[PDB]
Amino acid sequence: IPVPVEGVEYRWGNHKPQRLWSQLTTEGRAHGWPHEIIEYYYGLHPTTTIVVV
């Protein structure tokens, strides 16, 4: 099932329709003195506004 940030409601059988949501789960480390943290902000909104950097 594709879960974007906007959530997904699935209905299976004769239950009541249930809902899932996706919080921010991308994983770099977000901080470091040798940083390599531009990967983190590629984790949110990827292939978008990395062209600005």
Partner 1 sequence: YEHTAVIPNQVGFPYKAHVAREGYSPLTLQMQVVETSLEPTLNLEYITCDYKTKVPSPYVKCCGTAECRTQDKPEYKCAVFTGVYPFMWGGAYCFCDSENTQMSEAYVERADVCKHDYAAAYRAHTASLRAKIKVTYGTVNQTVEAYVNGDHAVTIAGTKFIFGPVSTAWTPFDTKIVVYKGEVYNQDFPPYGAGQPGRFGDIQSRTLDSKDLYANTGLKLARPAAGNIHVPYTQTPSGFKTWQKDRDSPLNAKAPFGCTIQTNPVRAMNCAVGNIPVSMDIADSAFTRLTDAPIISELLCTVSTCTHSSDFGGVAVLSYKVEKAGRCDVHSHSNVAVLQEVSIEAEGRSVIHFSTASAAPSFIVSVCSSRATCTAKCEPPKDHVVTYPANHNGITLPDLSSTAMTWAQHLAGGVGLLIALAVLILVIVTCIT
* Contact set with partner 1 (CB under 8 A): 3, 7, 9, 11, 19-27, 30-31, 35, 37, 41, 44-45
| Shortest distance, position 37 Cβ to partner 1, whole Å | 6
Local structure of 43: helix, strand or coil? helix
| Shortest distance, position 22 Cβ to partner 1, whole Å | 6
Query: In a 10 Å sphere around its CB, with 0-12 CB exposed, 13-18 middle and 19+ buried, how is residue 13 labelled?
Result: exposed
- Residue 41's identity, in one-letter code, is Y
| Shortest distance, position 5 Cβ to partner 1, whole Å | 8
